[PDB]
Write a structure and sequence with these properties.
This protein has 356 residues and is mostly beta strands. The protein is built from one helix and 27 strands. 2% of the residues lie in helices and 47% in strands. The two termini are 48 Å apart. It binds calcium ion (CA). The site of calcium ion has 8 residues, from strand 20. The PDB classes it as sugar binding protein.
Length: 356
């Protein structure tokens, strides 16, 4: 079998004498280890800085050495064996971290948050406003491109999520947009009526296990050919502070976003419709709650779900929608299909209107 390199373990910046460990496999009959200025293709790559003193572990999958003097700033690190060669990108200094995706912009305290990005090595802190994450709850993938943590006590309002490493800081603005909440079953909005609907406040012992105060459940047995079953018919508070959502914002740039916990997986058939301010003519139909993060239903975990506001409202600006008569936020579950019966158990909270 041919050698390969999975990763290189080292502390930054890499100075003369800094220990490195090449992690991979099949390091049999090593003939040379060297840094090269060549990238992408190492055919006839120069031996820019050779490593003459190194050790290999018992399973031939880890090579240890101290950085030679005169180390290149960037290029490739190469292990040349009898069979073939393996190489990996190398640079002496850390790049700043970056964040590409977050599992939710409003994670519930106590739940697990997932972040995708790059260069998560040597984490110093994870912060959100005036809150800081307990680093004992953090797990980082081996490729330093994914991490999880436990959401701490909630921030006081819209802030930046920030991951700080020894290499720098990555920031996500617009995090925890409490000012944009239109219905939370606590201080904002109210439940009006609905079949199969009951309020729930979690305490750790039963689904949804954690909750932001009161949430509402839709649950029960949903038969086949059921055209009227579960509803959450709610009064929402649409008067978001203009400092957090300008009046002239295009509705094409906004989403209705909420948290959803699906406790029991269900098959094809059951669907939700959503409509606002009684405008059934512009309802969004055939909806299955799926995570913005994964694109799929994540059974047993709170998900963030977004629906474009332009799929729900006739108005072209946020202010014009605010001026429309009424206040309702409605969700209705049916099963217009031959399939079933299905046991349903789902929870909803923290409806907000936010920019996409
Ligand atoms: Ca709530």
């Amino acid at each position: 079998p041919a050698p390969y390199i999975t990763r290189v373990a080292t502390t930054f910046p890499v100075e003369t004498g800094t220990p490195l460990r090449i992690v991979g496999g099949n390091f049999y009959e090593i003939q040379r280890v060297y840094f090269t200025t060549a990238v992408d293709d190492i055919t006839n790559a120069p031996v820019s800085v050779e490593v003459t003193d190194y050790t290999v572990n018992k399973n031939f999958d880890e090579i240890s050495f101290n950085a030679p003097a005169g180390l290149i700033d960037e290029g490739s690190l190469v292990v040349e064996c009898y069979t073939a060669s393996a190489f990996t990108p190398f640079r002496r200094t850390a790049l700043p971290p970056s964040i590409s995706k977050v599992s939710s912009m409003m994670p519930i305290t106590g739940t697990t948050v997932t972040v995708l990005g790059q260069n998560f090595m040597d984490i110093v802190s994870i912060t959100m406003g005036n809150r800081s994450v307990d680093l004992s709850t953090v797990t980082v993938s081996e490729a330093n491109d994914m991490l999880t943590f436990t959401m701490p006590r909630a921030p006081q309002g819209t802030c930046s999520l920030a991951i700080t490493t020894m290499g720098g800081t990555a920031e996500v603005p617009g995090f925890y947009p409490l000012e944009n909440i239109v219905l939370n079953y606590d201080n904002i909005g109210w439940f009006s009526w609905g079949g199969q609907a009951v309020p729930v406040t979690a305490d750790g012992t039963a689904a949804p296990f954690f909750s932001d105060g009161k949430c509402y459940s839709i649950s029960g047995e949903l038969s086949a050919w059921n055209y009227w079953w579960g509803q959450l018919q709610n009064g929402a508070v649409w008067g978001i502070d203009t400092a957090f959502l300008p009046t002239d914002t295009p509705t094409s740039e906004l989403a209705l976003q909420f948290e959803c916990f699906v406790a029991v997986e269900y098959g094809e058939g059951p669907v939700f419709r959503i409509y606002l301010k009684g405008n059934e003519a512009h309802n969004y139909t055939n909806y299955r709650p799926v995570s913005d993060f994964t694109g799929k239903t994540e059974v047993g975990q709170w998900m963030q779900c977004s629906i474009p506001l332009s799929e729900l409202v006739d108005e072209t600006t946020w202010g014009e929608f605010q001026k429309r008569d009424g206040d309702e936020l409605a969700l209705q579950m049916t099963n217009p299909s031959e399939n079933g019966p299905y046991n349903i158990e789902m929870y909803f909270d923290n409806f907000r209107v936010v920019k996409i």
